[PDB]
């Protein structure tokens, strides 16, 4: 792609990102002092493991629906065959959610916006996946230290999704070309805003895959203990992406 086309690509991705976020960044920032009390935290800690998993799977499913809408607005995504669209979303939707979540993370007090207020990782104790929760909090903390703009997250998440290395891609060369153009848009934007210093600080190739693999593993453990809860009370989209339907 030429220069004018790259700038158009940057504008298009940033607009697609802003239009596909449930909450405005300004809404999240204005809620920072709205923190769960010690009584409310104890309340979440006293919830049954199955109740907390159900609540978390519903919130993750809603976040994924927004990621699907984001993918659909990406130039070239809708021109790929359905097999490749599905391969990219199944491999990348959770990774996009993990990156987007730093917008709802307050590095000042290590809290996340969850169910209307900010709370620390202790809110999630009843899930019984402490190692995964602390790794997600560590990841959001590491991204927050980069001070990403909303435009930087938009371009980086388009790249998390448009990855030609995903196994199962039928039109690999077509995805390599969309990836190259998105990489140019991302690097052009960083060069234009004097933010190329972040390139070295972006998470390593393998960190997102590790977090996604841990999520799937913890789900399998929960599913063995509460199979009827997953079958009857988890969203169908969640099961499609994480437990093969």
């Amino acid at each position: 792609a030429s220069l004018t086309e790259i700038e158009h690509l940057v504008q298009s991705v940033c607009k697609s990102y802003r239009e596909t976020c449930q909450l405005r960044l300004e809404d999240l920032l204005r809620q920072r002092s709205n923190i769960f009390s010690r009584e409310e935290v104890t309340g979440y800690q006293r919830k049954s493991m199955w109740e907390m998993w159900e609540r978390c799977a519903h919130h993750l499913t809603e976040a994924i629906q927004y990621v699907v809408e984001f993918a659909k607005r990406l130039s070239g995504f809708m021109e790929l065959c359905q097999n490749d669209q599905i391969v990219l979303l199944k491999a990348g939707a959770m990774e996009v959610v993990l990156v987007r979540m730093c917008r709802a993370y307050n590095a000042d007090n290590r809290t996340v916006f969850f169910e209307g207020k900010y709370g620390g990782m202790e809110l999630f104790r009843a899930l019984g996946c402490s190692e995964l929760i602390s790794s997600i909090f560590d990841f959001s903390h590491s991204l927050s230290a980069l001070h990403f703009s909303e435009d930087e997250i938009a371009l980086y998440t388009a790249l998390v999704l448009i990855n030609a290395h995903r196994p199962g891609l039928q039109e690999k060369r077509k995805v390599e070309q969309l990836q190259y153009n998105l990489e140019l848009a991302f690097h052009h934007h960083l060069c234009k805003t004097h933010r190329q210093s972040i390139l070295a600080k972006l998470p390593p190739k393998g960190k997102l895959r590790s977090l996604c693999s841990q999520h799937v593993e913890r789900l399998q453990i929960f599913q063995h203990l509460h199979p009827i809860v997953v079958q009857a009370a988890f969203p169908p989209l969640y099961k499609e992406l994480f437990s093969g339907g």
Binding site: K72, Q82, Q85, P236, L237, E240
Partner: peptide, 12 residues
């Protein structure tokens, strides 16, 4: 198989 995703990608 992939019922929901197929519907979301078709739903225009």
């Amino acid at each position: 198989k992939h019922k929901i995703l197929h519907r979301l990608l078709q739903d225009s």
